[PDB]
Amino acid sequence: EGSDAPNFVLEDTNGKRIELSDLKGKGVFLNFWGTWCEPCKKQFPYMANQYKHFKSQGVEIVAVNVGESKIAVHNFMKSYGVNFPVVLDTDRQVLDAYDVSPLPTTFLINPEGKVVKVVTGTMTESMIHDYMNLIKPG
């Protein structure tokens, strides 16, 4: 759209305070997910591999888990090779702020804090790569 991404503050799995507006200057691949979401099992390892490249190119991932316990979320991260920030939307406030319907949904947010594209359903590693390029600082 080019619309303003709603700001939010959540904690990551180790207690790190992450506020979306502090990531201006970086692309944010904002991925709403749950451990029961089948596509996330294949998308997570693609995202981890791509992050190896993109983290130093100024694209951040914030993988917003929707409402699940730390133990289940940590277990999923171990299972699927997660090396990127995962935050806990424990009471669905951020999911609701983004008006998210199906999971997974990814918002591609550019370095200015604007939503440039919203994607739902399945995506391959090539698509993820291309998506991250859309939001990297120029």
PDB file of all heavy atoms in Angstrom, residues 21-27 58 110-113 137:
ATOM      1  N   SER A  21       9.134   0.788  15.642  1.00  0.00           N
ATOM      2  CA  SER A  21       9.640   2.080  15.159  1.00  0.00           C
ATOM      3  C   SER A  21      11.170   2.222  15.290  1.00  0.00           C
ATOM      4  O   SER A  21      11.798   2.950  14.504  1.00  0.00           O
ATOM      5  CB  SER A  21       8.922   3.233  15.846  1.00  0.00           C
ATOM      6  OG  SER A  21       9.091   3.123  17.235  1.00  0.00           O
ATOM      7  N   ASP A  22      11.759   1.506  16.257  1.00  0.00           N
ATOM      8  CA  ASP A  22      13.226   1.503  16.429  1.00  0.00           C
ATOM      9  C   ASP A  22      13.941   0.818  15.262  1.00  0.00           C
ATOM     10  O   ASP A  22      15.145   1.010  15.077  1.00  0.00           O
ATOM     11  CB  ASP A  22      13.664   0.821  17.732  1.00  0.00           C
ATOM     12  CG  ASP A  22      13.303   1.616  18.969  1.00  0.00           C
ATOM     13  OD1 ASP A  22      13.103   2.838  18.874  1.00  0.00           O
ATOM     14  OD2 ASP A  22      13.205   0.994  20.044  1.00  0.00           O
ATOM     15  N   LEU A  23      13.208   0.033  14.478  1.00  0.00           N
ATOM     16  CA  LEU A  23      13.778  -0.602  13.284  1.00  0.00           C
ATOM     17  C   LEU A  23      13.708   0.246  12.007  1.00  0.00           C
ATOM     18  O   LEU A  23      14.179  -0.189  10.964  1.00  0.00           O
ATOM     19  CB  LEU A  23      13.119  -1.986  13.033  1.00  0.00           C
ATOM     20  CG  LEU A  23      13.327  -2.983  14.188  1.00  0.00           C
ATOM     21  CD1 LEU A  23      12.427  -4.202  13.965  1.00  0.00           C
ATOM     22  CD2 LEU A  23      14.800  -3.409  14.280  1.00  0.00           C
ATOM     23  N   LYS A  24      13.162   1.456  12.067  1.00  0.00           N
ATOM     24  CA  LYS A  24      13.305   2.345  10.903  1.00  0.00           C
ATOM     25  C   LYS A  24      14.782   2.422  10.500  1.00  0.00           C
ATOM     26  O   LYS A  24      15.654   2.325  11.347  1.00  0.00           O
ATOM     27  CB  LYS A  24      12.725   3.731  11.171  1.00  0.00           C
ATOM     28  CG  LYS A  24      11.205   3.803  11.048  1.00  0.00           C
ATOM     29  CD  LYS A  24      10.755   5.277  11.097  1.00  0.00           C
ATOM     30  CE  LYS A  24       9.202   5.448  11.055  1.00  0.00           C
ATOM     31  NZ  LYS A  24       8.506   4.872  12.236  1.00  0.00           N
ATOM     32  N   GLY A  25      15.063   2.549   9.201  1.00  0.00           N
ATOM     33  CA  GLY A  25      16.440   2.423   8.715  1.00  0.00           C
ATOM     34  C   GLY A  25      16.776   1.013   8.213  1.00  0.00           C
ATOM     35  O   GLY A  25      17.752   0.823   7.481  1.00  0.00           O
ATOM     36  N   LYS A  26      15.961   0.035   8.623  1.00  0.00           N
ATOM     37  CA  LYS A  26      16.031  -1.347   8.150  1.00  0.00           C
ATOM     38  C   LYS A  26      14.700  -1.759   7.525  1.00  0.00           C
ATOM     39  O   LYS A  26      13.641  -1.257   7.916  1.00  0.00           O
ATOM     40  CB  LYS A  26      16.298  -2.315   9.320  1.00  0.00           C
ATOM     41  CG  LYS A  26      17.453  -1.930  10.272  1.00  0.00           C
ATOM     42  CD  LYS A  26      17.470  -2.839  11.490  1.00  0.00           C
ATOM     43  CE  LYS A  26      18.545  -2.426  12.492  1.00  0.00           C
ATOM     44  NZ  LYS A  26      18.247  -2.968  13.855  1.00  0.00           N
ATOM     45  N   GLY A  27      14.751  -2.682   6.564  1.00  0.00           N
ATOM     46  CA  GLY A  27      13.537  -3.417   6.145  1.00  0.00           C
ATOM     47  C   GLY A  27      13.135  -4.344   7.296  1.00  0.00           C
ATOM     48  O   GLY A  27      14.006  -4.793   8.057  1.00  0.00           O
ATOM     49  N   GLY A  58      20.782  -4.911   6.108  1.00  0.00           N
ATOM     50  CA  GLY A  58      19.779  -4.029   6.711  1.00  0.00           C
ATOM     51  C   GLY A  58      18.333  -4.444   6.521  1.00  0.00           C
ATOM     52  O   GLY A  58      17.436  -3.579   6.470  1.00  0.00           O
ATOM     53  N   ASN A 110       9.148  -1.323   4.599  1.00  0.00           N
ATOM     54  CA  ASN A 110      10.407  -0.753   4.074  1.00  0.00           C
ATOM     55  C   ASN A 110      11.148   0.067   5.193  1.00  0.00           C
ATOM     56  O   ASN A 110      10.637   0.162   6.329  1.00  0.00           O
ATOM     57  CB  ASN A 110      10.131   0.084   2.811  1.00  0.00           C
ATOM     58  CG  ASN A 110       9.350   1.378   3.098  1.00  0.00           C
ATOM     59  OD1 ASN A 110       9.168   1.815   4.255  1.00  0.00           O
ATOM     60  ND2 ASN A 110       8.920   2.022   2.030  1.00  0.00           N
ATOM     61  N   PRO A 111      12.373   0.580   4.905  1.00  0.00           N
ATOM     62  CA  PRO A 111      13.101   1.289   5.987  1.00  0.00           C
ATOM     63  C   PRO A 111      12.408   2.547   6.528  1.00  0.00           C
ATOM     64  O   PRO A 111      12.784   3.053   7.596  1.00  0.00           O
ATOM     65  CB  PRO A 111      14.451   1.619   5.337  1.00  0.00           C
ATOM     66  CG  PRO A 111      14.618   0.537   4.260  1.00  0.00           C
ATOM     67  CD  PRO A 111      13.206   0.466   3.694  1.00  0.00           C
ATOM     68  N   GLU A 112      11.399   3.045   5.821  1.00  0.00           N
ATOM     69  CA  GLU A 112      10.634   4.212   6.289  1.00  0.00           C
ATOM     70  C   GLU A 112       9.441   3.851   7.176  1.00  0.00           C
ATOM     71  O   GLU A 112       8.717   4.723   7.670  1.00  0.00           O
ATOM     72  CB  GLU A 112      10.232   5.094   5.113  1.00  0.00           C
ATOM     73  CG  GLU A 112      11.431   5.605   4.286  1.00  0.00           C
ATOM     74  CD  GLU A 112      12.017   4.561   3.316  1.00  0.00           C
ATOM     75  OE1 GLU A 112      11.269   3.730   2.764  1.00  0.00           O
ATOM     76  OE2 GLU A 112      13.249   4.545   3.128  1.00  0.00           O
ATOM     77  N   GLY A 113       9.249   2.553   7.416  1.00  0.00           N
ATOM     78  CA  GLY A 113       8.136   2.100   8.265  1.00  0.00           C
ATOM     79  C   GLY A 113       6.831   1.951   7.503  1.00  0.00           C
ATOM     80  O   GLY A 113       5.763   1.973   8.118  1.00  0.00           O
ATOM     81  N   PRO A 137      17.474  -1.337   2.490  1.00  0.00           N
ATOM     82  CA  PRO A 137      17.808   0.080   2.297  1.00  0.00           C
ATOM     83  C   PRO A 137      18.690   0.298   1.060  1.00  0.00           C
ATOM     84  O   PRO A 137      19.595  -0.519   0.804  1.00  0.00           O
ATOM     85  CB  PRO A 137      18.485   0.481   3.612  1.00  0.00           C
ATOM     86  CG  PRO A 137      18.860  -0.800   4.304  1.00  0.00           C
ATOM     87  CD  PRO A 137      17.978  -1.887   3.760  1.00  0.00           C
TER      88      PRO A 137
END
